[PDB]
Write a protein that binds this ligand. Structure first.
Ligand code: NAG
Ligand code: NAG
Ligand code: NAG
Ligand code: NAG
Ligand code: NAG
Ligand code: NAG
Ligand code: CA
Ligand code: CA
Lengths: 417, 205, 417, 204
């Protein structure tokens, strides 16, 4: 049951389940009501009539409390749990929800379901590293130029696919409650259909962190003053549910993510790949450059070919180019006295034992060159013939040639009878 | 057993099959059967499943979402529910795609293509069809596509025109140049490959 | 820290830790005292004076109880825990302890530490399949011929090395307590030093189950005139500790044993091997026959070479012998239109596309032989030249040869002017 | 903390280095330090560690078992203990083995080996040593080993003899058979490879 491989036995692009990555997670918030106990008011409509009712937020009474576990908790339409900000946070104040995924995600959407009216202006930023730096994702506002300094709804082009846009969509009250904002990461982007083959778009959807910031409140309702406060305590942010939908980013080389030894989240790497995102080749499979799966080719890494004289190799782009873009692997630290690109021949001073297959611990046999009779210790790889001295013969140069006999000199071991 | 004290757990499996304008969603009930499930709620949408929600009873193991935009990416969420509320969802996303119609068996290409050289300007080529009675007159709707290119060099972009008859006149041409001709038949949704190539050269005038 | 592989990076013989395989385990016994509360007497020596004191086994007084747990529990010389048999179970009767390891073990020794006088006759049987069949391991008796119908201590030869022997050693009635019987499996066996390369000895030492049977009691003490029962209740079997020392058997290919998903125990095979005992090669890795690690060669299994057009293979002994005992692997169901032993060439009806390397999906390109102009669809792999008809030429047979022209017949498409 | 209510746990690591007639045992204390350890008990034996037990204090990370037999398989058990008793043992087994001495730097083989054929029965061969003064007489204790074999067929297992002088008489041979001779020098613990081969064939 491995989806990363065929009916048999070849590999194929596999992707982790579509999930809500914000579910178990804890969200850090800039504002929350109940400390100290505070008043908040909700305005409702019947025909054209406003009815303003006021309640108390008691950060410590688990019934009138609104902690930010109520962003990521179970969403039940019946008993609804909402995080809620301080009563009056207004422009130029803003409230920030910030959520860390823990792994690189390819994010299909970000969605907030509000228990208050939606914001007039709201910004969404992401982080493709782990919270060290932030870049904008989406902007929502009535007046985009004057607020976020970005143009209003704009044509995204094949030049800039990565431009965060700003739309007046979902900036509308109403609903006064249960309002929904859904940001699709691939919405309005030209190359979306080709996403599989579009790297810029694969990048755009990648985030380790999501941070939403509510910039401005809709002013809604009639100030009736014995105290202005009643209308003031009624403008705040509340959201019942936060969802960042998407898939764990494995680059198509893994069907699931699992908890590491450190309880880190990582891909369960297949297709001979390594790395947390399966972004690199497994240690011995360097024979060709790493590549993400295209749903046509799985682009698995393939092991170096060493003759079982080495388990280390490195890739060479030139040797790859010359191979007809087949095999660029070269081998390191060839043992068993072998040497070569693939450890396919013998080191100086050795020769091939053809009694033994090319992959054998003893495949390379040392040529014993006679100390007195030979002119050097380096012999011929194929034959094993040593560089015999003058008048000397033999494979090892251990005997005198025909018409010769041994002298008492080491320099000239053989002379003629 | 049966327990309504709490919301049902998450479903055991969810699976989605995308079609042209429709999507078939199939699933299996939550593992613990002690928790009562009254039904299943299926949310769906483009880019996110907040567009529309459809509820079915506890007996349904599949549903076909209809009236969906073509070549679109749908996110689908499947929950089980009872009188307490809705449970933890499963997500799956699928993309609607044009159905791929299996290729029809190929027709046999025209045969006996011949080039008759009138002038420097034009060459007339004719052929035969063994898919036709020997009198060679057309009844069912056929059309022949005729392509020609310059033989020198080994490549040139082909020029082609059509015919409702078994003869055709190639008109604009280069004087004193060898030309490569060929023709295919297409009838209804079936077509044939290109015929054997016939060569001919203009009058050099 | 993988012991199965070199300083880098090649493999080597690796062996699981030496352990007492009987420790956590529960051993089944035929006899235990407490069922009714029963009497037992111990005889002690001071000088030439004997002193007999009696106690009560009562298997529900965790104090006065002697359960078989006490065989495999922690051995503490201070607080001693002893299983104890029924009072006077004597020849022709015998008491049997039987212990199941759960894994194939290479057992270096089996040792019993008694709280009673040792047996005059005792037998050790093993099981190499799981509790299904039993074979003798060792025999201990004063008279071996009359008891076990085996000769007394006997010379083993390189023939009968698997023969269980019988010695009169460790049959001595003293010590009256704390007596010890240690059966070494490799003791006295000729090839023991060469155990690494001796398969019969590797077999001999292999057991999944151990069963000891105490055949006959030493009768020791002075018969008492009041009640004979006192001399009867003083004769029993008692054991402080049961040990099967040895290493989990992984055939030299694993450095540890671990419990799989079904919670049974198995080797953590490495070396591209599979099996409980790493007795077989991992799928797609049998290019050469399996072999246990010799501490010289690790004898790892080698992957079949298919051009990434299939992962299935089977071994061919003949093709191995012809290879010079290198590679006998052949590939099954070559996909991507290739075919061959290694999937190194093209199926009938295709030819080699040399813009693409042999491992490319498109390495084999179909030769489209003209329906009208060609005499068949099977072309030449090298050239891609189709089997042209009588008057036709071309690569695909898509034209008439020189001095020829097209006819109106599909059967004889080209004729002569 | 320090706790004597119970026996100490099992030691953290055990390792054995076998040597020719002794065995070096090294270890590390049990993980939890709350359980007080008075010492360590080392059992050892051939085939099973019931032969002898040796106790050492809590300060020892190693001990050398001595007076062991010399090509033998020893099983070793290591426990830690306090006044309660002994804890759960670790086991390890090792084999005493002969030390591996090699190798002394090789000498230069004899030169000028010559074969003189005396009879059908015997052949007398002579040689020279360049590690000797030109008078070629022996002082230090050297000996030359001389090997011979039949050249036909390609192999025959060699016959060899030793000599304290620079000549030797090979007797007991087949008449009219070609023989291959060679000589090596050995001095003390140092040795040389075989010299260049000299051939000669016995008389009618
Ligand atoms: C909030 O809860 C704590 C305990 O519920 C209580 O002391 C406090 O009165 C509550 N809020 C108000 C009204 O102060
Ligand atoms: C339901 O909602 C109330 C208030 O909204 C909250 O106190 C409680 O924890 C919630 N419980 C569940 C199961 O949602
Ligand atoms: C948040 O408010 C601060 C000051 O109140 C302002 O400097 C900043 O630009 C605001 N950020 C957003 C995203 O509105
Ligand atoms: C045996 O021991 C148990 C536990 O004390 C006790 O219940 C039972 O009555 C005892 N009977 C004896 C000692 O005969
Ligand atoms: C002490 O010994 C008694 C009887 O021998 C036994 O029941 C008990 O379990 C022992 N205690 C420990 C801690 O082993
Ligand atoms: C055990 O006793 C039974 C009868 O009591 C006898 O048949 C059998 O041979 C005995 N086995 C051994 C191993 O002594
Ligand atoms: Ca909620
Ligand atoms: Ca015990």
């Amino acid at each position: 049951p491995d989806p990363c491989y065929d009916e048999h036995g070849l590999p194929r692009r596999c992707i982790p389940d579509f999930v809500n990555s914000a579910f178990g997670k804890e969200v850090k918030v800039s504002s929350t009501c109940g400390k100290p106990p505070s008043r908040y008011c909700v305005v409702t409509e019947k025909g054209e009539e406003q009815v303003r009712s006021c309640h108390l937020c008691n950060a410590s009474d688990p019934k009138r409390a609104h902690p930010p576990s109520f962003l990521t908790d179970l969403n039940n339409p019946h008993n609804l749990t909402c995080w809620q900000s301080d009563s009056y946070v207004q422009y130029p104040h803003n409230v920030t929800l910030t959520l860390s995924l823990g792994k690189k995600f390819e994010v299909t959407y970000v969605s907030l379901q509000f228990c208050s009216p939606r914001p007039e202006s709201m910004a969404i930023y992401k982080s493709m590293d782990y919270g060290k730096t932030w870049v904008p994702f989406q902007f929502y506002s009535t007046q985009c130029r004057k607020m976020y300094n970005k143009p209003s709804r704009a044509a995204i082009t094949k030049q800039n696919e990565q431009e965060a846009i700003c739309t007046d969509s979902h900036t509308d009250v109403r609903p006064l409650s249960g309002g929904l904002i859904a940001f699709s990461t691939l919405d309005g982007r030209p190359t979306a259909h080709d996403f599989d083959n579009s790297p810029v778009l694969q990048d755009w959807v990648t985030a380790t962190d999501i941070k939403v910031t509510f910039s401005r409140l809709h002013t809604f309702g009639d100030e009736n003053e014995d105290d202005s406060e009643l209308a003031r305590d009624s403008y705040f942010y509340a959201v019942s549910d936060l969802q960042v939908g998407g898939r764990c980013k494995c680059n198509g080389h893994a069907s699931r993510c699992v908890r590491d030894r450190d309880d880190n989240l990582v891909c369960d790497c297949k297709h001979n790949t390594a790395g947390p995102e399966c972004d690199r080749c497994k240690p011995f499979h360097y024979d060709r450059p790493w590549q993400r799966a295209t749903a046509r080719e799985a682009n698995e890494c393939v092991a170096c070919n060493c003759n079982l004289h080495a388990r280390r190799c490195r890739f060479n782009m030139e040797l790859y180019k010359l191979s007809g873009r087949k095999s660029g692997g070269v081998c390191l630290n060839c043992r068993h006295n072998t040497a070569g690109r693939h450890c396919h021949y013998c080191k100086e001073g050795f020769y091939r034992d053809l009694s033994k297959p090319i992959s054998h611990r003893k495949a390379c046999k040392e040529c014993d060159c006679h100390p007195v009779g030979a002119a050097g210790q380096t012999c011929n790889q194929t034959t094993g013939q040593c560089p015999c001295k003058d008048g000397v013969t033999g494979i090892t140069c251990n005997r005198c040639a025909k018409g010769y006999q041994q002298s008492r000199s080491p320099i000239a071991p053989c002379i003629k009878i | 057993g049966s327990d309504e004290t709490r919301v049902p757990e998450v479903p055991s499996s969810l699976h989605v099959r995308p079609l042209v304008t429709s999507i078939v969603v199939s699933w299996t009930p939550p593992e613990n059967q002690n928790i009562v499930v009254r039904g299943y709620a299926i949310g769906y949408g483009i880019g996110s499943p907040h567009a529309q929600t459809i509820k079915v009873d506890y007996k349904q193991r599949y549903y076909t979402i209809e009236n969906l935009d073509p070549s679109s990416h749908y996110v689908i969420t499947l929950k089980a529910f009872n009188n307490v509320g809705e449970g933890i969802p499963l997500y799956e996303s699928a993309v609607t795609r044009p159905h791929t119609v299996p290729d029809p068996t190929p027709m046999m290409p025209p045969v006996g293509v011949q080039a008759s050289i009138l002038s420097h300007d034009t060459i007339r080529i004719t052929w035969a069809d063994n898919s036709l009675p020997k009198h060679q007159k057309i009844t069912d709707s056929r059309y022949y596509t005729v392509r020609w290119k310059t033989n020198i060099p080994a490549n040139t972009k082909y020029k082609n025109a059509q015919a409702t008859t078994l003869s055709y006149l190639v008109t604009g041409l280069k004087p004193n140049t060898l030309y490569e001709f060929s023709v295919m038949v297409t009838k209804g949704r079936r077509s044939s490959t290109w015929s054997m190539t016939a060569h001919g050269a203009t009058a050099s005038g």
